[PDB]
Amino acid sequence: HMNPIVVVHGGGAGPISKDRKERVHQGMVRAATVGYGILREGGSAVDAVEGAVVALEDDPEFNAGCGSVLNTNGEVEMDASIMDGKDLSAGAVSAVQCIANPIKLARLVMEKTPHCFLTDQGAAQFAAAMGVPEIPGEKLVTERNKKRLEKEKHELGSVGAVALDCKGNVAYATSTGGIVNKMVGRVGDSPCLGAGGYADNDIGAVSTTGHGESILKVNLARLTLFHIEQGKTVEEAADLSLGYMKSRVKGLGGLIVVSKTGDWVAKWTSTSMPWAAAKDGKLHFGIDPDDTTITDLP
Amino acid sequence: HMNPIVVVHGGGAGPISKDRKERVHQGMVRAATVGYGILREGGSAVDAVEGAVVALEDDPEFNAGCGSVLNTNGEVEMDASIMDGKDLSAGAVSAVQCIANPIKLARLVMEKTPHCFLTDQGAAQFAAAMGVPEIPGEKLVTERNKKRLEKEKQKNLGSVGAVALDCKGNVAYATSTGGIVNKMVGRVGDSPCLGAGGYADNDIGAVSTTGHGESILKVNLARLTLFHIEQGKTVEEAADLSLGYMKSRVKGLGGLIVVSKTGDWVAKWTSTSMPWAAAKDGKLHFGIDPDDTTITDLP
Ligand code: NA
Ligand code: NA
Structure with missing residues (x-):
């Protein structure tokens, strides 16, 4: 059977201040721990x-x-999606208001309804x-988010995870608040299967972040997979797809990917993308390029 | 400068009743002629x-x-999307009500916002x-449909769309739908969603899709088709394959229409029927069923 792995990301965004880097380090390791936890018990890529x-x-x-x-309008309007690579079953929501966990509801959509x-x-x-x-x-709402809103008025991207399980299934999940002073009812890529993520057991899975x-417009996640179906390394693919995104539509961001045979990578063309990965009891973390740290993980 | 073409499609589902066939015909005819009159007057593919x-x-x-x-709950909710093949520019609207033309509202999103x-x-x-x-x-809200909802108390009647290649070599698609009857409030299908309902790129071509949203x-049917045309597959070969994989992998059935950068085109479907029409080289082609393809002169 497979060795399970989770990969997680925060925003593919600008450079992050070095006090906020610490809460960011801990949050990433946290999310990673909850996913590895579940896996290490033989649980599913989706959970x-x-x-x-x-x-x-x-x-x-x-x-x-x-x-x-x-x-x-200074209000939280959220997007999230989830996908299971076995059946390509999927669920998503846009512009949801007034709940804690948009990603659960995406999962509620995937399994209680015949829609997506x-x-x-x-x-x-x-x-x-x-x-x-x-x-x-x-x-x-955080007081930081009110402040930042008046900044772009009077003139931190998506989050997500990919997994491979001890059964060989893969999944992706994505969720976001969208962007600062976004139009009302604006829908990003985070709930668009192919764009904000994709998951296929016969390939791998991807979560993206960036300029949505x-x-x-480039279907960034399924594109990353197209490069793998042509038999490129995971590294190369992300780099072709991120590299395509830059050169064709002037867009920055990043993604995490796990192929169906175990290998995984976190790459970005924006400044920084928080990320972490948990495989074989080691945890891999980072933010800025070539600045990784490996730790142990129970 | 390339000879322009425009293909249009109705919904890709079960058989049409005889009483409607000529009505569907009259629709497909005027929609294709209109589009090709835009392409006759030097119009853009997006237009x-x-x-x-x-x-x-x-x-x-x-x-x-x-x-x-x-x-x-008896109301109309509409999705649409449109894409410019030149710079991948796009607009889409999901779950809109009480406006007459959602595709027109999708255009304004592309044109007049920071958002797709x-x-x-x-x-x-x-x-x-x-x-x-x-x-x-x-x-x-029409009568035909009131009787479908009450009866259902789900049927995938489909979506309409178009692809075009304009005289500069630019490609475009537009897809629009009312969706699947009896749907939950807020159900969005394939049509507003780029890479699925349709995709347009000058580097390869433009596709628009219909069927079960x-x-x-799930298989991202429009972009999947254009991947194969990238690989060497003809437009008919790629439609075959992209539609076959949706049939095998998820057991969905639909149709598509596709036009290449060269102006190679096809209408293809795995559903029983799909109303389609094309205009190109002063000629108007039209089918609903396999093999009934009429090809009359366009004046
Ligand atoms: Na949060
Ligand atoms: Na109509």
Whole structure:
């Protein structure tokens, strides 16, 4: 049987201050631990990435769940998606408001409905009948996010995880608040199968982050896979696809990928992308290029 | 300069009833002629795909705008998307109501925002603010469809779209749908979603798709087709393969239309029927079933 692995990422974004790097280090290791945990018990690729993403949704350092950036109206409107490489079963939501964990609801969409994509008010109604707790806006809002909003007015990207399990299934999960002063009801790549992620057992899985208009226009995650189906290393593929994204539509960001045969990589063309990976009891972490650290992980 | 072409498609599903065939014909004809009149007057491919799909939106006989299916509480919710092949520029709208032309609203998203994709109340607000009219939601609601919803109490009647190659060698697609009848509030399918409902790139071509929304999304059918044309596959060979893999892998059935950078084109489907029409070299081709392909002169 396979050796399981989880890979996680934060924003493919600008350079991050070195106090915020510490809470970022700890948050990444956390999400990674919840996913590896579940795996190491022979659990599924789907639950692990869901585990991991959920831990970054509940952390206000990251641009997903609580700590989601604010739209034009200073409100949190969130996107998330999930996919299982075995059946290509999938679930997603756009523009959801007033809940803790948009990624759970994507998973609720994947397994309770014969659809794959619910948005704004219809997602919010599905939530009610699944009894998702509806909570006030402020509980997701951080004082940092109000400040940053007046900055781009008076003139931290997606989060995600990929996994391979001890059975050989892969999955991806993605979630985000979108972007600062985004138009109302703006939908990013994070809920667009192929763009914000893809998962196929006969290939591998990918979670992306960056400029989401760019990402959607090149189908960045499925493109990364196209390079692997042509038999490139995982490294090369990400580099062709990220490299295509730069040269064709002037777009920066990054992605994490795991192929069906065990290998995995975290690459980016933006400045920094927090990331972590947990395989064989070692944990791999980093933010800036060629700055990795390996630790041990129970 | 290349000879321009435009292909249009209706929904890719079960057989049409005799009483509708000539109605569907009249729709496909006017939508293709319209689009090719844009291409006759030096028009852009984006302009060509847009107008051919407005036709279909306007026509009560097709599942988009006027005549879209109803969701489970009896209302119309519409998705559309459009893409410029030159710079990969795009716009999309999901779950929109009470506007007459969603494809037209998708165009404004591409043109007049920092964003590729808008949804729901956001989309209402943006349409309203850009001078798009409000129309009683009752006007998109037709009789044929009321009897489908009550009866269902799900049928995948489909989507309409278009692809075009304009005289400069630019490609484009537009896809629009009312979706699957009886749907949950807020269900979005393949049509607004780039790489699935359609994809356009000057480097390879343009595709638009129809069928079961969820399956086209899963295998990313439009982009998947263009991957194979990249590999050497002809437009017919790639449609075969991309549609075969959706059939084997997820057991979805649909159709597509595709036009290459050279102006090679095909209509292909694995569903029983798919209304399609093309205009090219002063000629108007049209089928619904396999082998019925008529080819009359276009004046
Ligand atoms: Na968060
Ligand atoms: Na119509």
